[PDB]
Amino acid sequence: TVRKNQATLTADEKRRFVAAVLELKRSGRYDEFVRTHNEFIMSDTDSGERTGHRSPSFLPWHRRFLLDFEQALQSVDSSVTLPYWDWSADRTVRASLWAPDFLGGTGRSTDGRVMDGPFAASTGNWPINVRVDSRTYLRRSLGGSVAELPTRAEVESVLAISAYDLPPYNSASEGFRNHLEGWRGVNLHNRVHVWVGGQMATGVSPNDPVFWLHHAYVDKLWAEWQRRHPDSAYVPTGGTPDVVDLNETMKPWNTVRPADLLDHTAYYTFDAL
Amino acid sequence: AAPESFDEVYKGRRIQGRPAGYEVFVDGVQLHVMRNADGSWISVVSHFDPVPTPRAAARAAVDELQGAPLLPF
Ligand SMILES: [O-][O-]
Ligand SMILES: [Cu+2]
Ligand SMILES: [Cu+2]
Ligand SMILES: [Cu+2]
């Protein structure tokens, strides 16, 4: 299983990825990923139980959630793997990611509606069902709410941070995890959600297929951090109320721990690391 | 200490907030909101962009909705 930079996919690989995503949507399986994600967005709190977000398990949790989604895609087409979007490099609306043969572009100005690509509401193939905003079409406003995606220099400043995470292990933390997540500092992952806009700015952000490509690159940055800091590892390592310690199991699966997900090569490799 | 309650018409939508942590409504439909450890707020329709107060989160939700009804959670 090799996870490839989206920019490098062949036309055939793009076609197969899109078709597998559309089939998960048609069959009803896609929307339950969106629902699970929103449940954790709403339940993870700074002062209470926190598992998928704003906590050290943000990274292993999304790594397992993406593995569940990739496995679902492979159950439709076994050749498909999740690509990643390096938003530090492919940083404009003219990027091939946003072309009509891949994810389609930005939303029109009046209502945010995406008007092209395979996920445009006009196709009839991408109903927005799990939603809070009652509108049922994919929406985006690329670069609308924040002017720029993060740069390679900003990403490197975060990869340089030695500590994986720090008490109090929430949105107030110093350390790598919270700077990558983006609640403190120059802001990597949260800012990309804000930059895409539309459903990507919400708790139902997996409604946009770019969600998976964004998180596949956040996941790659975790792998890059590990190679820069082989001496540094996940924390905390036991006994922390409300936080998933290294060897504790994680909801919703309950059968996996951060420890089981630190080494991605158990599951996939990257085109380059 | 919880923020004060509020009630206003913002961009033609009635927004209300009240301590409960804290509940927000847009035309009577409850909107999930959350407080961050540094005292900023977010909502489920603007989760990744902290704003200073629950009223600011309600107003960001009305801006996001562009006139559309909110659905309950
Ligand atoms: O966090 O998506
Ligand atoms: Cu998430
Ligand atoms: Cu709640
Ligand atoms: Cu995310």
From TrEMBL, chain A:
<feature type="binding site">
    <location>
        <position position="62"/>
    </location>
    <ligand>
        <name>Cu(2+) 2</name>
    </ligand>
</feature>
<comment type="similarity">
    <text>Belongs to the tyrosinase family.</text>
</comment>
<keyword id="KW-0479">Metal-binding</keyword>
<feature type="binding site">
    <location>
        <position position="215"/>
    </location>
    <ligand>
        <name>Cu(+) 2</name>
    </ligand>
</feature>
<feature type="binding site">
    <location>
        <position position="37"/>
    </location>
    <ligand>
        <name>Cu(2+) 3</name>
    </ligand>
</feature>
<keyword id="KW-0560">Oxidoreductase</keyword>
<feature type="binding site">
    <location>
        <position position="53"/>
    </location>
    <ligand>
        <name>Cu(2+) 1</name>
    </ligand>
</feature>
<feature type="domain" description="Tyrosinase copper-binding">
    <location>
        <begin position="53"/>
        <end position="70"/>
    </location>
</feature>
<feature type="binding site">
    <location>
        <position position="193"/>
    </location>
    <ligand>
        <name>Cu(2+) 6</name>
    </ligand>
</feature>
<feature type="binding site">
    <location>
        <position position="62"/>
    </location>
    <ligand>
        <name>Cu(2+) 3</name>
    </ligand>
</feature>
<dbReference type="GO" id="GO:0046872">
    <property type="term" value="F:metal ion binding"/>
</dbReference>
<feature type="binding site">
    <location>
        <position position="53"/>
    </location>
    <ligand>
        <name>Cu(+) 1</name>
    </ligand>
</feature>
<feature type="binding site">
    <location>
        <position position="174"/>
    </location>
    <ligand>
        <name>Cu(2+) 5</name>
    </ligand>
</feature>
<feature type="domain" description="Tyrosinase copper-binding">
    <location>
        <begin position="208"/>
        <end position="219"/>
    </location>
</feature>
<feature type="binding site">
    <location>
        <position position="37"/>
    </location>
    <ligand>
        <name>Cu(+) 1</name>
    </ligand>
</feature>
<keyword id="KW-0186">Copper</keyword>
<feature type="binding site">
    <location>
        <position position="189"/>
    </location>
    <ligand>
        <name>Cu(2+) 6</name>
    </ligand>
</feature>
<feature type="binding site">
    <location>
        <position position="62"/>
    </location>
    <ligand>
        <name>Cu(+) 1</name>
    </ligand>
</feature>
<dbReference type="InterPro" id="IPR008922">
    <property type="entry name" value="Di-copper_centre_dom_sf"/>
</dbReference>
<protein>
    <submittedName>
        <fullName>Tyrosinase</fullName>
    </submittedName>
</protein>
<feature type="binding site">
    <location>
        <position position="37"/>
    </location>
    <ligand>
        <name>Cu(2+) 2</name>
    </ligand>
</feature>
<feature type="binding site">
    <location>
        <position position="189"/>
    </location>
    <ligand>
        <name>Cu(+) 2</name>
    </ligand>
</feature>
UniProtKB/TrEMBL annotation, chain B:
<feature type="binding site">
    <location>
        <position position="47"/>
    </location>
    <ligand>
        <name>Cu(2+) 4</name>
    </ligand>
</feature>
<dbReference type="GO" id="GO:0005507">
    <property type="term" value="F:copper ion binding"/>
</dbReference>
<feature type="binding site">
    <location>
        <position position="47"/>
    </location>
    <ligand>
        <name>Cu(2+) 5</name>
    </ligand>
</feature>
<feature type="binding site">
    <location>
        <position position="34"/>
    </location>
    <ligand>
        <name>Cu(2+) 4</name>
    </ligand>
</feature>
<keyword id="KW-0732">Signal</keyword>
<feature type="binding site">
    <location>
        <position position="32"/>
    </location>
    <ligand>
        <name>Cu(2+) 4</name>
    </ligand>
</feature>
<feature type="binding site">
    <location>
        <position position="48"/>
    </location>
    <ligand>
        <name>Cu(2+) 6</name>
    </ligand>
</feature>
<dbReference type="GO" id="GO:0042438">
    <property type="term" value="P:melanin biosynthetic process"/>
</dbReference>
<feature type="binding site">
    <location>
        <position position="32"/>
    </location>
    <ligand>
        <name>Cu(2+) 3</name>
    </ligand>
</feature>
<feature type="binding site">
    <location>
        <position position="32"/>
    </location>
    <ligand>
        <name>Cu(2+) 2</name>
    </ligand>
</feature>
<feature type="binding site">
    <location>
        <position position="32"/>
    </location>
    <ligand>
        <name>Cu(+) 2</name>
    </ligand>
</feature>
<keyword id="KW-0479">Metal-binding</keyword>
<feature type="binding site">
    <location>
        <position position="47"/>
    </location>
    <ligand>
        <name>Cu(2+) 2</name>
    </ligand>
</feature>
<comment type="similarity">
    <text>Belongs to the melC1 family.</text>
</comment>
<feature type="binding site">
    <location>
        <position position="34"/>
    </location>
    <ligand>
        <name>Cu(+) 2</name>
    </ligand>
</feature>
<keyword id="KW-0186">Copper</keyword>
<feature type="binding site">
    <location>
        <position position="32"/>
    </location>
    <ligand>
        <name>Cu(+) 1</name>
    </ligand>
</feature>
<feature type="binding site">
    <location>
        <position position="32"/>
    </location>
    <ligand>
        <name>Cu(2+) 1</name>
    </ligand>
</feature>
<protein>
    <submittedName>
        <fullName>MelC</fullName>
    </submittedName>
</protein>
<feature type="binding site">
    <location>
        <position position="47"/>
    </location>
    <ligand>
        <name>Cu(+) 2</name>
    </ligand>
</feature>
